[PDB]
Amino acid sequence: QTNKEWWNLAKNIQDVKCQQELNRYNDLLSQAYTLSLDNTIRNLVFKAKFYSWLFVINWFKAFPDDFHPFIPGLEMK
Amino acid sequence: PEDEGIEQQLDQQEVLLSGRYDPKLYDFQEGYTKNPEDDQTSLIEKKAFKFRYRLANETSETFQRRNNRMVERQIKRFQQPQYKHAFEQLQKNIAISSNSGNALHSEYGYLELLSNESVQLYKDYYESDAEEDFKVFENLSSKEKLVMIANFENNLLPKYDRSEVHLIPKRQWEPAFGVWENFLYDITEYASFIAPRGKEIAADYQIQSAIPLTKEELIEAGLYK
Amino acid sequence: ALTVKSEAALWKGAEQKVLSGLNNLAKTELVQITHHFGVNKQGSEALWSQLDKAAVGAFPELSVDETLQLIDGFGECPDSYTLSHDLNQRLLVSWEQLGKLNFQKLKETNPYFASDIVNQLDAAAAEFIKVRPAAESEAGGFLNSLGVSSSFNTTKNDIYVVQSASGKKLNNKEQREAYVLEKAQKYLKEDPQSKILDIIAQK
Amino acid sequence: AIRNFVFKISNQIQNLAAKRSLAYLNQIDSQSVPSRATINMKDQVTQMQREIDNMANVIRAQIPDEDRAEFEILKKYYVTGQHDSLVDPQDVLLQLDRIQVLKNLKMIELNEE
Amino acid sequence: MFLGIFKDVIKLLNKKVVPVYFWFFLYCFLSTMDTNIFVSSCSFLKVEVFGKDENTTLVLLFYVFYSLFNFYLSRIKNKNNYLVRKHLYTTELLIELILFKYKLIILKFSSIKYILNFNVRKFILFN
Amino acid sequence: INFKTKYRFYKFISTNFNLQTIIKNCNDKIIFSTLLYIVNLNYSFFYKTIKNTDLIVYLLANKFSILNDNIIVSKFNISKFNDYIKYINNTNSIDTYLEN
Amino acid sequence: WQDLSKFACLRASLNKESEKAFQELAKKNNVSPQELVELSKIVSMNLDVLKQNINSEQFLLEKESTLKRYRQSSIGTRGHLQTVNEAVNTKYPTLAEGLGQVAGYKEAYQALREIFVHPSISVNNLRQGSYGQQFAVDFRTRADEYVKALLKDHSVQTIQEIQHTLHQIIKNYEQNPASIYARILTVL
């Protein structure tokens, strides 16, 4: 359940044993959620809406930094 | 002799043998939740909690036999040349280690060996148990290893209380010196004698609390056979 | 013939008289490479300084400043003890400049080679050696004329972590002491006037 | 008496300092929270170094061939040479200039073929 | 010894320790432009050099001339002296340029959040 | 100063240690010259009261008594955070236990 | 003080039956060899005697140095060293004579008296350093003669240690001639 960006970057991640250590290199692997889109007038409003919905959902989600279920970890690796 | 360590060990054994700490009499549950929820603690943490209070759910004779086997295995393992070299290096790199809280080279190896010994003791204590997955101890995370090393107990150390007293000669105040001269001489003496000797004594006490006794020494005391 | 002359160096010295005549002929002919090879052979039969200088110059292609032919013209068995001032000075300058050029080439190829050599030398060196003052800057300009140049000295209280590159177990402290003592004894046998044992006392 | 009070205060301070500097060697604490702190510090240092190495590997993976050679040189400099004193920044610049000379030759060939 | 004290004061004030340019700057800060012996004379200095709010032509001319002379001298210098130690400031500048190159290469392929998190963790670890 | 003396020193050094571990894929004379130049450039501050030949002999003896083959040597000053972070990470206790 | 004691021990180790004599003396004093050695070190520290073997101006500094050495010696924890010294003079009053009566100890003491102590030394003159250096040179010559005499017999490590101890004692005399001579006279 991962994107090709993760496995490519996961292949570049070496010398890690604990998921906590992988929990340290979190934002480095966060690039797999690029979500590329155009800069059209319609897409820009949609992009703003998506970003607002994601930010507002995370506050209600309130998951701890160790629990990153939305970001694949060392198990998939 | 009301030796602190021996008395504390006997009190702990009596408390755990009173039956008021047997695991069957209590149901471990996370009391925080408003709805009754069982203990959702980690598997390694639960195993450590069980091993730490091993005698509480065990009988006296069972504790005696298991502890005897575990202690024999621990003595045999600590008799290894690698452990001897590690202990020698730890004893050597002492004074410099007293100069900062940054860990020395031999101390990290000591911690790793302590974690390995904790794993071995946890495996040996319940060696007859048929509901424990030894492979679960294969690879531990940072938190898992830190938790496991917490209950590690070097059994080869002297069980006697290490609290002692040392007498350091005190230089008297000269009757021919003035206030300033006496203060200067006293400050110089205080530093040069007390600080080195005091630091050495404290480090020696800590090391003795950390350095286990030699196997033959135990044999020389009849502690083990 | 000249290659055969080399065999004369390996063969008995009966042909050295014939080799001496051939060397006189070669000095008359003013050879560049053949003279160098003949000098290397003959001065390997006698001493080693001249042979090493001739071989190294031939390898470096020191065609210019070929005064060695005049050195080859020396009659003491086609050699000479206490060679001319030019012969010694030229060889010394050649060795020094070759060392400098090789060091420059190594720095251009492996910039860490110099630091690696220094660390390898100073790792097991005496403690006083580790207190050697840092090198100074010879640069010119407004610095060293108008302002004040900051020094490059440091605390120099380090720990030399020696790990074998081949992974083999290193020599123990006692083994290193024994090897150092044996090498010092061998050197003292070579050099009557030396304070090497004093260095063994850690300065 | 005053010396006695001074000696008692000094003994207390020395014992506290020994605990604050050597308790990681001893197993006095029931939970061994001091040794846990030392193990955590060692693990954090190892994690920082490993994260640096992994970032270097990822950067090497996400670059071209000439870019990879230049990144290798620059990373070796910033890793070892930057903390070393007997290394030549002039030599590093010379290697970089040779690479740039090859690149400029390629650029001129492209712009004027 | 008072003589020793005077000798030490003189030695510490040597040009090898006290920059002559620093001494000149101190003298300039201590003397007014009217009483500035080195400056009250040269009228072009008092009018053309520092008397113009905008002397861009003169500034550009001086910069171009200095740059050309320094480029020629630098070519001459880099054409020789294969084994010599440069000034500490220059060596630090070169090392800083290399470090800036490495940092830009890192920043190209790294997220700002990851970089900030790593830097904060490193600072906490250092503390 | 003497060519014969320099050659004798070079011969003694060659019979004593192997410059190939010092510099790989090079001639013995060039290796000796490079070693002398490096010693002069770096160990000059101690050459005032110590003979150059003696200092070279001591350095070579130490470098060969550490091991007869090539080794990796790192200088770390634990007083610095960067070095201390590198000191512990680069060091493996089992390695020391193996005398490697 | 401690250097002189070490030199005396090294010189007494050479003599034969000295161990048996020390054991006999310790048995007469109801002590062991180690206790006898410690008591002998205490007896050597005779501050009252030290009051008469040095110039008065050097007494306070010498007294402080002796107190520092005692607190740094193994017998510091015994108590007020000066008073503790008197304790020895009351506990085994005659043992002092035994301290010079043993074979190896007597030989070492006689050698120390001969090599170092000479009549040319003026105690009040010890405040200067030039006379101290001259006495150090003379004692160095005497120590070379004594080392040669010792090397004439016993045919190694003991001889080398004795020579090193003599050199160290000469160095101590060079550094502080007044204190060194006062300590030598007090020990004698």
Ligand code: HEM
């Ligand atoms: C417009 C005509 C003048 C020109 C082009 C001229 C040019 C210069 C220049 C280039 C300097 C050196 C400044 C520097 O490079 O830092 C200088 C300094 C000086 N000039 Fe002039 N100057 C002129 C007029 C004068 C006059 C009229 C006087 C006399 C009243 C004078 C006296 C000085 C003095 C005393 C110095 C300082 C020299 C030293 O301190 O070693 N200059 N001038």
